Design an enzyme around this catalytic site. Structure first.
Site, PDB file in Angstrom:
ATOM      1  N   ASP A 104       0.841  -1.191   0.000  1.00 50.45           N
ATOM      2  CA  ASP A 104       0.000   0.000   0.000  1.00 50.45           C
ATOM      3  C   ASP A 104       0.879   1.246   0.000  1.00 50.45           C
ATOM      4  O   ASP A 104       1.523   1.561   1.006  1.00 50.45           O
ATOM      5  CB  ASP A 104      -0.930   0.013   1.216  1.00 50.45           C
ATOM      6  CG  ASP A 104      -1.893   1.193   1.211  1.00 50.45           C
ATOM      7  OD1 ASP A 104      -1.753   2.047   0.369  1.00 50.45           O
ATOM      8  OD2 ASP A 104      -2.760   1.229   2.053  1.00 50.45           O
ATOM      9  N   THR A 157      -3.011   7.431  -5.989  1.00 47.76           N
ATOM     10  CA  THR A 157      -1.951   7.636  -5.008  1.00 47.76           C
ATOM     11  C   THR A 157      -0.577   7.641  -5.669  1.00 47.76           C
ATOM     12  O   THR A 157       0.072   8.688  -5.759  1.00 47.76           O
ATOM     13  CB  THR A 157      -1.993   6.556  -3.912  1.00 47.76           C
ATOM     14  OG1 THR A 157      -3.262   6.598  -3.245  1.00 47.76           O
ATOM     15  CG2 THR A 157      -0.884   6.782  -2.897  1.00 47.76           C
ATOM     16  N   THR A 158      -0.127   6.473  -6.132  1.00 51.15           N
ATOM     17  CA  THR A 158       1.235   6.356  -6.642  1.00 51.15           C
ATOM     18  C   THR A 158       1.359   6.888  -8.065  1.00 51.15           C
ATOM     19  O   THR A 158       2.454   7.275  -8.485  1.00 51.15           O
ATOM     20  CB  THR A 158       1.716   4.894  -6.599  1.00 51.15           C
ATOM     21  OG1 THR A 158       0.906   4.097  -7.473  1.00 51.15           O
ATOM     22  CG2 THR A 158       1.621   4.342  -5.183  1.00 51.15           C
ATOM     23  N   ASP A 173     -14.801   1.507  -1.611  1.00 48.89           N
ATOM     24  CA  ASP A 173     -13.881   1.601  -2.737  1.00 48.89           C
ATOM     25  C   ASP A 173     -14.616   1.519  -4.068  1.00 48.89           C
ATOM     26  O   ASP A 173     -14.273   2.243  -5.010  1.00 48.89           O
ATOM     27  CB  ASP A 173     -12.829   0.491  -2.662  1.00 48.89           C
ATOM     28  CG  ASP A 173     -11.789   0.732  -1.577  1.00 48.89           C
ATOM     29  OD1 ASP A 173     -11.826   1.774  -0.966  1.00 48.89           O
ATOM     30  OD2 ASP A 173     -10.966  -0.127  -1.369  1.00 48.89           O
TER      31      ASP A 173
END
Lengths: 506, 477, 497, 504
Positions: free
Chosen positions: B43, B76-77, B345
């Site tokens: 994560d 996020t990434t 989600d």
């Protein structure tokens, strides 16, 4: 990574040349280990004095020797192209492109570049050997050495060149212009306007005889002797002096040169009767006298065989800048094979450095000989910027990972138009993007008109963008470019191939 | 310039940590605590959670990830990797070319506008009114969750959730809000202990876990009159025509029998805050004492009243006809919490598609397509901005690069093949994760909500300006 | 490396300036120079100072080389080259730190020197007889050079000798070797003896007096080099007479020449005067070839080392040769020699350094008159020319826009280092003189400059303080080149070992 | 003590300048402030940059303390104090090494202020030349180029200014200042952006309560009664309040809490203009525009009515004109109202919310530029024109202060120098050209000999040229620039007076 360490080493000499090349370039102070201050823009003089440390530098330095010996120009073009060709390779290395793949790319670009250089030809020197055709090339060669002094040096060289290029016609297989055809001497004192050119040999040593001049006849005959002059010694041992000139003059000789020492009475009598006496410490310069005065040295003593006499128009002693010199010259006949550049200048560094520049201008004329040397390229990075655009086109045409190498290959040719800017003081954040647009246009035609002539402005004429090379007649020698590309491409290939440096058995 | 360089070196490290955290084959990162702890999580939020950073520029990379996660549930990434290389590819342009930061910042703004053009061009339309396709879309889009075997309702539960919250307005008078959704607040999910995941259902209104006082009571009133009271009194209640008596405190037998005699139900242990939620969906007046009951105690807007027990607890249904309550069922509160970890989600997945009915070519085809389209724009753009404009193109190639690297293929050759496939071929050519092969997204779907790519690029260029605009790091208290 | 190599190079040239800055002016200071021979020289002569600096820094070697050229090419102004050249580099410090490139700076310095030379040409006044008589042209200038000195009270004494010292030369051929100076200890300043030609202090190191009549109305001077002094059991003597007879006949071979004056580079003793006393021939050995070559340029003789090959062609005759007891020592003089273009002055005074002050005070006054005859175009002194170029270059920076405006402005600021050091070395209030001079010059007067008599500004033409035009032009052109040499260095590569 | 503390003092203040140097200009670069807690903040606000700046060297506590007074006293001028002062001190140390006594340096800097204040006072401009020519349009364009309406700002900015041109008020005893909350503008979806209309008068946010009531009453001179208490059934009495409107003589009625069906029809029969449910803040401005006084409750010793001739306001003409989905009440003029209105047309209210963002800033900035009466030609004009004039001032004294007059004057170029460095444009080219354009303005222009010899040309940081900042529209208060220079020399003298530091 040996290739990474090599990149670090070349960054040192890249910094050296990056600020060197160009008429607006910066000088380097070079301190000789024997106690001489050398201030010059010549990177070949630099690398001759620069001690070499990292073996990868030995590749780049020996590369410049190939350029300088074989071609009288291209010194910084090798160092500048080589520096950036290896700098841009750092991106290819870091992107993961292997050494052999980078090598394969530069070799593929070697073919693309050479073929395009043949298409970049604008004009051609038709080999008229005319002062005007010489000036078209001599001026840009003198440029990059002394900015704004081209007027003094161009009149010096182009007239001196006409002395060693004799009237030749229908001559493409007869070579002319040896490098030693033009001699340059240094007289401390005066300025640029005090320099001149003598149509023949000038001895930096002061007049050794007491005679100033010969007769007034044309083609004064002259003798050179090899054996020492004294009372006739028999063929063996012996355990007349002036009679030599009684023999020499029989054919019409007013000037007597002795390649060796002088006997008792002749030292007085040779000069007493109004004949010039000479003894030369430089023995090659005696071979020069064979070429200037036409004199054939007599191998024997006191026996001037008619075939051992030459014909020289005029030999006088002259005063240059107050320091006396002796002149053995020709005059509108028996035309001299050597002409002398008289440099009067007060600063011994500028005086010597001016000679270093003129030496290179002499060398350029050696490349203005017949070996396909008339081809002109557009100067001021018009060759370089146009190559950038044409190289990127070959990238679009080339599939594979070679496309990545070609792209970085074009980037490398930006170092030359960049160097022209960083030294000239115009903002590289403005000049370079204006160069791109000036040469990158959509032509209503396959022949770019006025868009292959776009240049780089090194002058103080404030203008947004760049100028036209035809304004100053700025053209580059194709052979200098083509040979330089071959040297730098192979030289960078060499450095890119060094995987490990191993010390030999000791 | 030295201070700006230190800002660049910060983000490069942040990216090198997150660089390989992208992909179904992502490499694991080892988190070493000073107490000897070791966590191998994939994560990237957890990675960013523990990364102890020095340069405040890295702290802005953390605030950047907070911004992305709070708005778009994913990205996020993608943002950390994208934003970092956007700064990194500009590094030689700052140091070597001596380009002033203002010039670089202006160039990035123009690349942002042009990039949004390409993102629109590569989009694929999807009909949000085709619920059957939205189920296939969301169910595939939530791929790799714990509820794959329960994904039928774990998907449909979220579809019926967003079905109603849609902030629906469209006209040329005020504008189209574009179905703005607030999953955090507007949606109030009531997780019901007991049942199974597939037994979960969706309601309309507010649902309370407050239980009933007497087992015999009026079970369903279609049009009730609800009295919200906290505390003679039992008779006072009936004066206002009530049908349901709700008490905040505990309730004795007397309130059970006296109100039942008149046909009124009894509900206990309902706080005034739940009495307010009753007012939100019905409209009864909150009252403390029974002697203070007035005619304003009304049970309007009450569609269904239900008293059924689930999970050792009776529930009070406040059903009415930007708000909804889901009757989620789970064998335990941890199962109910596992539903949230997978269901909400999916709510974000649906929020993204409901935000814009458009899909993005996945497998990295979006990024490589941008890298090609920007190149054609760059050579046609005049000015010094020819240099920094190319930086975004080189930065957009990192995301597809990390998809290759974590796939174990040749990171150099496979990228060059992708370049040719997007150059002469279709914009739909991407990277397969399992095979490691260059595949078209027509065959291997992986179609991603476009707004994820839109907000990812917007927040990346935005943060890039925040990192470049800093000229020095100065101490002050 | 890089732009900071210039910073280091400027710092080095500044060090040279700081050592040479106190030397500007006849009222200026001295530098004590200890040479490697332990030969200590205290001098304000910038030509001597620069010769002996022994600078090792590569950049300062260039600066000094430029200034040593000023001496050979012009001969005066070597101090102004070092001060002007250095300040033009000092004023460049703020420009380098602001990012101004070496081409941008150097192109501006070339622009300024072009603008300046033309304004020097306009200032030039051709003084031949223009508002000046022939005698006072030289006289009033030499009187100015000597004003307010230790020789002030003897100004009439030294100016009478000084003006005619140069006037006694060949007005077509000026050369420093034709005015020689002897350091004669003993006697007062006004006791200095002027020799119409050349004199030497008789280095003959032996006796022999009361022989060899030493004074000649028509001598025949012969120059030798070799020493003609000499220095069975009875047979031991033969080896002494064998050599004696040889050199004794060689002494006769001098008599066979017919010389009245015999010179030698080697010591001549009494054993040589054996014959010369017998034939009455004056002989003086250990004589400098400079005075001997002045004999060659005075009477027209020739130097023959030996005695046998000498013919009358080696002899020469002067109008008067006399040995005098003047000077608490015997001195030999030549006057009125047929070929002589030379003169000498025997300086007498309280001490060798008292003579040195008179010597260099005279040496400058000699150059003042020297170039009064050499140069036809003169320019204003006292820094008035430096203010003249200052005003004009300031006006050009007003009408020129671009980067040149700031660079030209620096050129003008540096032009005031010359009047500045003239003020500081004279003890004046530099702030006051620089300001009063600048404003008064801007009011239109082109001749205002430093007055050393009273701390003030005034007309240096009326004060007859004149400097050669080519001194100003060639020095300014040289200084511009010097700044082009130092500011153009990007790297120093030293081959060590 | 001595040259040691003088050298240390300069290095300290130059280090402070290294912090604010890059922040000067609308396109400058920000600084990152880091505390020991671990928080960070990035700003170009000069007051915040200096407030959080940690100064250890004691000399900087003087320089910062001044700027702290500068912000608390004036509210702006915090960046110029540090940059101007640090250059004054940098050049002063050169005067010290040149044998200039610190007292002489201070004396001359004060004389230069006496001369400079006069020059600045002469070369400034008043709040004029803003009508009929793009001085406030380009000022507004400056604020509006950053808005989404930027492309159409030529059309919108005409209304920003033209509306503000008519709202001159006396405020506190004739200040001549514009109201900030004024020109009631309506965000409407009507038509395209460029077709937004400018209204010659004020529009109270409301319409005629009933479309049946007459909408234009007393075109020449109209009285308006504003009531709060409703006319609704609690009915003949609340209807009779209309009969009191009739007897009391209110021609336009502003009834806040609503109107009964009988009252609405009674207004029709009475030929009186009825209005319902107006914004309270606008009604208070109506109380100051027309004078209609909102009556929250009817008491006045048992009075119940519009209070004949008491609570009624005065207006010239009240009209409700239909502009295609815009039917609202227009107020022409009156004795004192100073009100106006603008119609906004565009895509939709969400797009007109950009006009909310645009007018909130644009009305505020344009008002701030007209807040100050005397204004300064910006862009280094006040710094560079001093550079030229102060050079000529060198001839007025010409003794020992002449050296300090020059260094004071040259220090004023640090502002146009820094403005260029922070703008990425060539700093040496721009500054030199600024000097030459202002140089000639001091030659023949004051002789009234001018073909195009006109100053107020200043540095354009966007287009990269030197432009007439009057036609370009960059202005700064004279109270700011004059106070800036006054403040700057206060610290310059303060630091130059420090010749000893004793540590106990």
């Amino acid at each position: 990574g040996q290739i990474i360490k090599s990149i670090a080493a070349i960054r040192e000499l890249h910094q050296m040349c990056l600020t060197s090349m160009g008429p607006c370039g910066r000088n380097k102070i070079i301190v000789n280990h024997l106690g001489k201050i050398i201030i010059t823009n010549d990177a070949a003089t630099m690398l001759r004095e620069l001690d070499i440390v990292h073996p990868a530098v030995k590749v780049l330095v020996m590369a410049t020797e190939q350029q300088k010996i074989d071609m009288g120009d291209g010194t910084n073009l090798v160092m500048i192209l080589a520096g950036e060709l290896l700098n841009v390779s750092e991106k290819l290395i870091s992107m993961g492109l292997s050494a052999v793949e980078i090598i394969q790319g530069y070799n593929m670009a070697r073919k693309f570049t050479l073929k395009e250089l043949d298409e970049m030809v604008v004009g051609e020197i038709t080999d008229k050997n005319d002062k005007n055709e010489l000036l078209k090339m001599i001026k840009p060669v003198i440029s990059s050495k002394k900015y704004g002094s081209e007027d003094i040096l161009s009149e010096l060289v182009s007239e001196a060149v006409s002395h060693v290029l004799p009237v030749a016609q229908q001559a493409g297989e007869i070579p002319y212009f040896n490098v030693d055809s033009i001699r340059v001497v240094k007289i401390m004192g005066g300025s640029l306007s005090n320099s001149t050119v003598i149509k023949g040999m000038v001895f930096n040593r002061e007049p050794e005889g007491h005679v100033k001049s010969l007769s007034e006849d044309k083609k004064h005959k002259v003798a050179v002797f090899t054996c020492p002059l004294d009372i006739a010694n028999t063929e063996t041992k012996g355990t007349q002096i002036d009679a030599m000139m009684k023999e020499i003059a029989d054919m019409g000789v007013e000037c007597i040169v002795a390649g060796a020492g002088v006997g008792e009475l002749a030292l007085h009598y040779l000069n007493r009767y109004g004949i010039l006496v000479l003894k030369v410490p430089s023995k090659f310069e005696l071979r020069r006298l064979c070429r200037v005065c036409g004199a054939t040295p007599l191998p024997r003593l006191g026996a001037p065989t008619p075939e051992e006499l030459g014909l020289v128009e005029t030999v006088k002693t002259m005063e240059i800048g107050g320091d006396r010199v002796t002149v053995f010259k020709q005059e509108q006949g028996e035309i001299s094979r050597t002409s002398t550049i008289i440099l009067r200048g007060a600063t011994q560094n500028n005086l010597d450095d001016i000679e270093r520049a003129i030496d290179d201008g002499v060398a350029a004329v050696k490349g203005l000989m017949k070996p396909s040397g008339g081809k002109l390229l557009p100067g001021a990075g018009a060759t370089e910027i146009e190559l950038i655009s044409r190289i990127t086109k070959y990238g679009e045409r080339t599939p594979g990972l070679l496309q990545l190498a070609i792209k970085q290959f074009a980037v490398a040719f930006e170092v030359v138009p960049r160097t022209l800017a960083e030294t000239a003081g115009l903002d590289v954040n403005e000049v370079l993007p204006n160069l791109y647009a000036a040469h990158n246009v959509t032509e209503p035609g396959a022949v770019k008109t006025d868009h292959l002539y776009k240049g780089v402005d090194i002058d103080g004429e404030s203008d947004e963008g760049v100028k036209d090379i035809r304004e100053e007649n700025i053209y580059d020698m194709l052979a200098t470019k083509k040979f330089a590309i071959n040297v730098a491409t192979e030289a960078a290939t060499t450095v890119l191939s060094i995987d490990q440096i191993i010390m030999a058995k000791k | 310039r030295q201070a700006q360089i230190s800002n660049i070196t910060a983000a490069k490290a942040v990216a090198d940590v997150i660089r390989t955290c992208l992909g179904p084959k992502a490499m694991l990162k080892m988190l070493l605590d000073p107490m000897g702890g070791l966590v191998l999580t994939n994560d990237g939020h957890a990675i960013l959670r523990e990364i102890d950073v020095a340069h405040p520029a890295a702290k802005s990379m953390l605030e950047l990830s907070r911004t992305q996660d709070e708005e778009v549930g994913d990205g996020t990434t993608t943002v950390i990797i994208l934003a970092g290389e956007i700064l990194a590819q500009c590094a030689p342009y700052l140091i070597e070319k001596n380009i002033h930061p203002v010039i670089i910042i202006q160039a990035l703004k123009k690349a942002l506008t042009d990039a949004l053009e390409v993102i629109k061009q590569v989009s694929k339309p999807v009909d949000v009114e085709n619920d059957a396709a939205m189920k296939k879309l969301i169910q595939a889009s939530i791929g790799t969750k714990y509820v794959i075997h329960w994904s039928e309702k774990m998907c449909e539960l979220a579809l019926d959730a967003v079905k109603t919250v849609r902030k629906d307005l469209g006209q040329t008078v005020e504008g189209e809000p574009n179905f703005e959704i607030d999953i955090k607040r507007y949606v109030r999910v009531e997780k019901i202990p007991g049942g199974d995941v597939l037994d979960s259902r969706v309601l309309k209104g507010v649902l309370l876990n407050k239980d009933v006082v007497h087992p015999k009571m009026s079970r369903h009133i279609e049009n009730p009159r609800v009295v919200l009271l906290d505390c003679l009194m039992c008779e006072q209640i009936l004066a206002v025509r009530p049908t349901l008596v709700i008490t905040e405190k505990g309730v004795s037998d007397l309130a059970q029998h006296y109100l039942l005699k008149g046909g009124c139900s009894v509900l206990r242990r309902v706080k005034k805050s739940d009495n307010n939620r009753i007012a939100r969906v019905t409209g009864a007046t909150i009252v403390n004492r029974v002697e203070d009951l007035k005619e304003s105690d009304v049970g309007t807007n009450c569609g269904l009243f239900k008293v059924e027990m689930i999970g050792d607890e009776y529930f009070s249904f406040l059903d009415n006809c930007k708000a909804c309550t889901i009757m989620l069922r789970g064998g335990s509160k941890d199962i109910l919490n596992e539903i949230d970890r997978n269901l909400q989600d999916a709510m974000a997945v649906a929020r993204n598609v409901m935000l814009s009915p458009s899909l993005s070519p996945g497998g990295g085809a979006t990024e490589m397509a941008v890298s090609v389209k920007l190149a054609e724009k760059a050579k046609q753009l005049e000015g010094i901005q020819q240099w920094p404009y190319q930086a975004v193109a080189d930065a957009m190639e990192c995301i597809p690069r990390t998809l290759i690297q974590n796939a174990g293929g040749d990171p150099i050759r496979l990228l060059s093949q992708l370049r040719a496939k997007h150059a002469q071929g279709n914009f739909t050519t991407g990277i397969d994760g399992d095979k490691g092969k260059i595949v078209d997204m027509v065959s291997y779907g992986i179609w991603e909500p476009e707004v994820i790519k839109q907000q990812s690029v917007k927040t990346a260029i935005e943060s890039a300006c925040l990192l470049l605009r800093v000229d020095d790091i100065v101490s002050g208290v | 490396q890089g732009k900071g190599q210039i910073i280091s190079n400027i710092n080095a040239c500044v060090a040279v300036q700081e050592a040479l800055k106190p030397t500007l002016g006849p009222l200026g200071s001295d530098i004590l120079i200890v040479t490697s021979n332990q030969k200590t020289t205290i001098s304000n002569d910038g030509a001597t100072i620069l010769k002996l600096l022994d600078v090792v820094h590569p950049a300062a070697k260039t600066l000094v080389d430029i200034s040593r050229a000023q001496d050979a090419e012009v001969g005066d102004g070597t101090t102004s080259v070092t001060i002007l050249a250095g300040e033009l580099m000092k004023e460049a410090k703020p420009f380098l730190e602001e990012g101004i490139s070496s081409h941008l700076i150097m192109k501006g310095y070339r622009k300024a020197v072009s603008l300046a030379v033309e304004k020097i040409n306009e200032l030039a006044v051709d003084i031949t007889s223009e508002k000046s008589s022939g005698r006072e042209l030289l006289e009033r200038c030499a009187r100015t050079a000597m004003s307010s000195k230790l020789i002030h009270n003897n100004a009439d004494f030294f100016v009478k000798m000084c003006v005619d010292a140069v006037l006694s030369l060949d007005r077509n051929d000026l050369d420093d070797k034709l005015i020689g100076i002897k350091k004669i200890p003993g006697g007062a300043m006004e006791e200095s003896l002027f020799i119409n030609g050349v004199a030497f202090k008789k280095t003959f190191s032996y006796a022999g007096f009361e022989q060899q009549p030493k004074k000649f109305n028509n001598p025949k001077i012969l120059s030798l080099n070799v020493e003609l002094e000499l220095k069975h059991v009875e047979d031991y003597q033969a080896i002494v007479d064998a050599e004696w007879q040889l050199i004794f006949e060689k002494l006769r071979q001098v008599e066979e020449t017919g010389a009245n004056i015999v010179l030698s580079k080697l010591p001549i003793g009494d054993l040589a005067t054996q014959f010369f006393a017998d034939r009455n021939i004056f002989c003086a050995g250990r004589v400098s070839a400079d005075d001997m070559n002045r004999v060659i340029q005075a009477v027209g003789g020739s130097i023959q080392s030996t005695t046998s090959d000498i013919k009358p062609e080696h002899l020469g005759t002067c109008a008067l040769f006399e040995e005098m007891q003047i000077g608490s020592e015997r001195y030999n003089l030549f006057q009125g020699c047929p070929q002589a273009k030379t003169c000498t002055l025997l300086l007498r005074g309280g001490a060798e350094q008292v003579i040195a002050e008179v010597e260099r005070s005279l040496h400058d006054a000699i150059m003042i008159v020297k170039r009064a005859l050499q140069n036809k175009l003169i320019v204003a002194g006292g820094g008035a020319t430096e203010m003249e170029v200052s005003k004009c270059l300031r006006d050009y920076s007003k009408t020129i826009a671009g980067k040149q405006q700031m660079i030209i402005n620096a050129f003008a600021k540096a032009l005031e280092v010359i009047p500045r050091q003239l003020c500081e070395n004279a003890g004046f209030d530099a702030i006051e003189i620089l300001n009063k001079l600048r404003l008064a010059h801007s009011k239109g007067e082109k001749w205002y400059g430093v007055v050393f008599e009273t701390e003030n500004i005034g007309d240096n033409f009326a004060k007859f303080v004149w400097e050669p035009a080519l001194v100003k032009i060639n020095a300014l052109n040289s200084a511009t080149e010097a700044t082009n040499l130092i500011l153009s260095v990007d790297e120093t590569i030293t081959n060590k070992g | 003590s001595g040259d040691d503390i003088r050298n240390q003092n300069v290095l300290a203040t130059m280090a402070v300048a290294n912090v604010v140097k890059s922040s000067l200009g609308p396109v400058g670069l920000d600084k990152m402030l880091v505390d020991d807690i671990g928080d960070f903040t990035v700003t170009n606000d000069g007051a915040t940059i200096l407030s959080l700046l940690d100064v250890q060297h004691p000399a900087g506590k003087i320089l910062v303390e001044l700027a702290q007074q500068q912000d608390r006293e004036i509210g702006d001028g915090t960046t110029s104090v540090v940059i101007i002062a640090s250059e004054l001190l940098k050049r002063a140390n050169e005067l010290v090494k040149n044998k200039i006594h610190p007292t002489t340096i201070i004396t001359g800097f004060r004389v230069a202020l006496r001369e400079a204040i006069r020059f600045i006072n002469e070369v400034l401009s008043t709040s004029v030349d803003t009508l009929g020519k793009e001085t406030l349009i380009n000022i507004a364009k400056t604020s509006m180029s950053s808005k989404i309406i930027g492309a159409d700002s030529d059309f919108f900015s005409n209304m920003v200014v033209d509306a503000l041109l008519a709202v001159k008020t006396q405020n506190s005893k004739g200040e001549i200042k514009y109201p900030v909350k004024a020109v009631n503008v309506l965000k409407a979806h009507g038509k395209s952006a460029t077709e937004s209309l400018l209204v010659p008068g004020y529009a109270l946010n409301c319409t005629v309560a009933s479309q049946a009531m007459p909408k234009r009453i007393a075109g020449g001179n109209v009285k308006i009664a504003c009531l709060d208490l409703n006319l609704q059934k609690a009915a003949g009495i609340v209807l009779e309040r209309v009969k009191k409107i009739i007897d009391a003589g209110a021609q336009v009625v502003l009834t806040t809490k609503g109107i009964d069906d009988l009252c609405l029809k009674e207004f029709v029969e009475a030929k009186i203009m009825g209005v319902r449910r107006c914004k309270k803040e606008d009604l208070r401005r109506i109380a100051r525009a027309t004078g209609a006084t909102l009556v929250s409750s009817m008491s006045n010793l048992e009075g119940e009515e519009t209070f004949e001739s008491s609570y009624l306001g005065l207006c010239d003409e009240v009209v409700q004109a239909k502009f295609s989905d815009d039917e609202c009440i227009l107020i022409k003029g009156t004795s004192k109202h100073s009100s106006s209105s603008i119609i906004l047309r565009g895509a939709n209210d969400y797009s007109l919310d950009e006009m909310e963002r645009s007018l909130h800033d644009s009305l505020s900035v344009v008002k701030r530029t007209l807040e100050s009466g005397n204004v300064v030609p910006g862009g280094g004009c006040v710094e560079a024109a001093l550079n030229i004039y102060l050079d000529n001032f060198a001839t007025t004294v010409g003794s020992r202060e002449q050296l300090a007059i020059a260094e004071f004057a040259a220090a004023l170029l640090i502002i146009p120098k820094t403005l260029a460095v922070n703008a990425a444009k060539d700093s040496s080219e721009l500054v030199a050209k600024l000097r030459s354009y202002h140089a000639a303005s001091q030659m023949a222009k004051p002789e009234d000999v001018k073909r195009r010899s006109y100053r107020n040309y200043g540095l354009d940081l966007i287009r990269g040229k030197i432009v007439d900042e009057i036609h370009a529209g960059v202005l700064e208060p004279t109270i700011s620039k004059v106070k800036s220079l006054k403040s700057a020399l206060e610290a310059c003298v303060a630091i130059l007076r420090i010749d000893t530091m004793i540590t106990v």
